[PDB]
């Protein structure tokens, strides 16, 4: 909490990591300004890690001498040792025990802070002698995983598999994941990625994947790996055109100094430079509302949403952007809890593994990925493949793993900072599968009225009144509060992602058996998570964080959001003191909650179940894919046993790696005029029909430049703009309630230049020819009427 | 009337069937078409890697198994550094020959962003301004 | 309406540079896009004239591009 | 699928399953061809089979169209109309199809046996396509000749050069000829390879 | 009745083709007829901004005296601009004072 931060403070001043000036430079503790600040933790590294062995040291010393206890951390000097034995029994020697489940379950999330494993990467393992020179080929450290396991967490009761592909369930995939994302940075970052061997077709020879090595799940061989084919079916072509190992193994070597990530190949000869244009610009239009007492100097309502341009090099930087996404280690029992819970929240809706003859793609002339992209749109692929390849294709991605290549480009859009953002176009190969995977608990998210996830739900015919009307599920002393993740796109950990991708998996309990569920899970993730991008004719590697074009996007974010939530809801609770919680349940409550964290191992479905009905009664959410509003108790809140934006700004700063200052989470304390902004429509109270109800409404100045300035040059003329506004005044509508008069205008003038467009048609029509029909029902558009019903609840 | 319905029955029904027809030809002409493409494109990519050095390097390898970013790093014939700064230019790839991966090249043609040659004399400290930057520099191995 | 008016004729002057090929000159697309990404975020006006004066030059330094009497005409 | 006739040249979606080598045939070629002889199946882009489950009916003159496929006189559907009718059975391009009066050679290839003088003297005086379809023809029959043939089992080797190799028990022995080339086996258990040309 | 509803029909027919011809040709023209609207509606734009400076540039700029470079900002910067004859010399020029 960075208002009262004073032991960091006298911490890395008296251990020499940094001098005192540095903390009189303003904004220092940001991880996204300064990224220096990383090398100054970083050099606690030689001190964590003496501790470590130091403990390692004294459990066997305890165990060889035959005492039992429990190893507490409050109990160790930074030094290294150990000098508390108040609560130590004796028993007979060679028999003792330590119970360290909440010494190493603590230490974890600063044990990638601190980066306290690199002087693991030196040889001899000492800090000042040079590196270690791994041969380029080994592929494969299970061995050394090992070993870095028994000699650091030597007591950790629990088992742990390097290779993740023999692992029980989704309580050991998450523990072993969770432990190699630690385990993986001593190892060279050049021998990860697909593996390749050459096979045999038709006499001539090939190299194509049939494995992986991820940097958490560890090892993964195919299962179907085919030598001395001879035909070449449409299938098959299929894996083999979108696999990366043909390309990177075709093109040429490239060293990149534009950016900081890594890069794998070059496909052409020359680099390509992206440019992005401005905008047209709708004079009429314009014109005609500097003549109606618009835009005029030192007024209320003005453009602040234009097309905004950039020069060659914008898509690498904004590629480069990724270098904010660092290899978290997440806590491993509170995370293992907070799965539970935030599983609750998923009760209702059903799913599975569905057939091809059922998935239905909305929309079909959308480009396919690369490189399928050079030959057709996705139509001509899905009409391609019959129901039946198309069906063997994902039966065979059930049992194997398929690398693939997404492209990256830039967006044509409104916006109201010149920031250039980017947008990625999975390859066709994996959205037919995670389609045919996921569609069915999909298409029943998104059709259930009255939950937390609320995707799906319209903001018209009343539905933003019974949204806002459901979301105080009767709490106590209502407070609504929100918040934003920055960068949420570029550092969302790889464990939550893992997460996000289980808790959407843990449906199909009976369509799919356990080995599948592994392969779509690996598969998910070397086609996602950590894949080969191609950001201006060039490979690269993605080192984490999610991508914004797969199928799974916006469920996948709901998921991460909620997990936050309850996280930071966790954190605040235990956090309190406890002995002055007056009330005789709460108290109680906390007492078991940390009992059935740390000092258990399995379930406890009663306990989970108290715990999630307490949250859905002090404090109520809801949810899109990001943008929260939550109604928190507030006499509780403020006595320390829910949430709060300082808390949750302490728990982005130990598991996003982000800072979220607090200028840009608005907190309503009234209850009637509703949420601040959500989803980017503030609300207003406005009477209808002898009772109240809320509206939503945009920001003016969003609908002039809509109005005012258009992408395309054919959208300056008043053909199809008389049906472009209008959708533009149907969205600009609740204005004509607001109190402030610009707002009460920014309406009337969409209103009557529909009028004189359709005025001038005519004219030109019946000038044209000499004669109109029936082109009558349009004076229907410019009565305030027709829109007035599009915010009643009848339909 | 009986049979003028039939009649017009017909007329749809036939309609239906020939467009039906005509949808199935374009589907399967386009299929072939595509189907040869993505052959072509697979055998004339195969035809370049270069054959010798990787079935070195592979029949070297344990297993078969190589992880795939060091099949370029050691088998590639080019090298295209990309220069953003006269300073980093100093420092990575000065002169004629430089060294990286372990290996000995020697540039070949500096194009600048306009796809321009650029003489290896232009490019000196106070001849910064004028080169649009980037910097492509090619290479080969040697 | 004198502020807002500083801004529509950036976006104008840009969109008809563009349309003569000066996207080639990779330090002169550098240049124009900065002066016009510049101008539309001034809340001043002085300054908003001074990069349109810069950027307008940018348009006059060609001769034979764009006939200038028969359109000043 | 789309080709052109054999005969008119004119785009089509029709072939003559019942031929061995299937060539593309206009509406009213085809028609001549198929009403003439005992070639009684006809495949456009879909085959021209009743759809009807357990009606194994196979000439298109018995055959209807009716919803969206085609049946037997027996499961057919109220409105449903033959496939045969004005000289044409029901395909692609059916108001282009120009045709011909050729079919009388035509044929005679599709009959002919291979098996007489005759045939061949007509095979290489006929029209261009009517000879290259006449080679295709004859060279498939004597392929199917050559693999209505069999196997040789090796009595004993005598040396490199001088073998005792007795043929196929009720076959009639391929002589000691040099054209035919025989590749020979060697079954493990258990993956008989190919042991090469001899 | 029935023939009423053939005219209906006609009409509604007729006013497809009367109502996307139109569509068409505008949409054509205007796609057609574009590198010359922009620079027109630019001068227009320019003419009406009403400023001193851009106007004196601009005249320069048409009777000869154009500018090589980007005009710079800051107090200290190069300006290489040609002039074509004596007469707009002694109009600009005076000692060593270059006024533009
Ligand atoms: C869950 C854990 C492991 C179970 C086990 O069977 N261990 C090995 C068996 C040892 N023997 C004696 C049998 C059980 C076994 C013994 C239990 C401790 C002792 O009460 C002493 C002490 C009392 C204090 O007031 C509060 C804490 C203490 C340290 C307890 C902690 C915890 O609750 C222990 C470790
Ligand atoms: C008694 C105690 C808890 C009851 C259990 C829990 C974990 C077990 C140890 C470690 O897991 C692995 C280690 C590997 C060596 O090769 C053999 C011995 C080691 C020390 C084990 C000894 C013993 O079995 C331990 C301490
Ligand atoms: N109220 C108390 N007064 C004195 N000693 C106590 C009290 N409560 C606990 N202790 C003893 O002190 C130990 C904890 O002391 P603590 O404050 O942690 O100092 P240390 O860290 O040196 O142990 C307990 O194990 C117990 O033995
Ligand atoms: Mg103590
Ligand atoms: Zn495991
Ligand atoms: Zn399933
Ligand atoms: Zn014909
Ligand atoms: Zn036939
Ligand atoms: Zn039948």
Redesign the pocket.
Known sequence: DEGNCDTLKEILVTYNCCDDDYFNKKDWYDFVENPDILRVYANLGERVRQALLKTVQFC?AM?NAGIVGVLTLDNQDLNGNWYDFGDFIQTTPG?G??VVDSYYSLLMPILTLTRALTAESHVDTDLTKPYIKWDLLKYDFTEERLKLF?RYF????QTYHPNCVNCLDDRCILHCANFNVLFSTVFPPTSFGPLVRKIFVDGVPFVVSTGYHFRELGVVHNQDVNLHSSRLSFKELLVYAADPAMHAASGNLLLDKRTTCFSVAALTNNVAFQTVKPGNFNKDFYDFAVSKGFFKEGSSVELKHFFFAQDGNAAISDYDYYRYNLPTMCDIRQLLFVVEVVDKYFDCYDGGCINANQVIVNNLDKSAGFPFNKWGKARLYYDSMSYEDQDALFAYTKRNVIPTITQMNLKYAISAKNRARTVAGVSICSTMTNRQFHQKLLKSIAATRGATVVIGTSKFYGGWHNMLKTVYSDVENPHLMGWDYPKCDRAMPNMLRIMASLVLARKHTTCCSLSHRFYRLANECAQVLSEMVMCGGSLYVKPGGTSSGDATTAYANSVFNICQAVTANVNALLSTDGNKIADKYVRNLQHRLYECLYRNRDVDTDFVNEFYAYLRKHFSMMILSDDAVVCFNSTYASQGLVASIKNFKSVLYYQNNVFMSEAKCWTETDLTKGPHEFCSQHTMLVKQGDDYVYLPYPDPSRILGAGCFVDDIVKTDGTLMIERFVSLAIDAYPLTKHPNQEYADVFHLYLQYIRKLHDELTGHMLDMYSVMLTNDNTSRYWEPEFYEAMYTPHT | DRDAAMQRKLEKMADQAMTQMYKQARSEDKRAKVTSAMQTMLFTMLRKLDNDALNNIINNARDGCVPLNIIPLTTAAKLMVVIPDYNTYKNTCDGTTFTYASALWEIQQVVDADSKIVQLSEISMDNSPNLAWPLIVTALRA | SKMSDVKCTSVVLLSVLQQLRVESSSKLWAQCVQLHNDILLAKDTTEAFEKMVSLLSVLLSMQGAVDINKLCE | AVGACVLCNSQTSLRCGACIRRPFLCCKCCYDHVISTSHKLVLSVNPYVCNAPGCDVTDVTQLYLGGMSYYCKSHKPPISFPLCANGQVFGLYKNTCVGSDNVTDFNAIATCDWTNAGDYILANTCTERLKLFAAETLKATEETFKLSYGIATVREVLSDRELHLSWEVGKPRPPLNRNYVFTGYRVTKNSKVQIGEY
């Open positions: 066997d165990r028999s025990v330590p028994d030597k007591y950790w009761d």
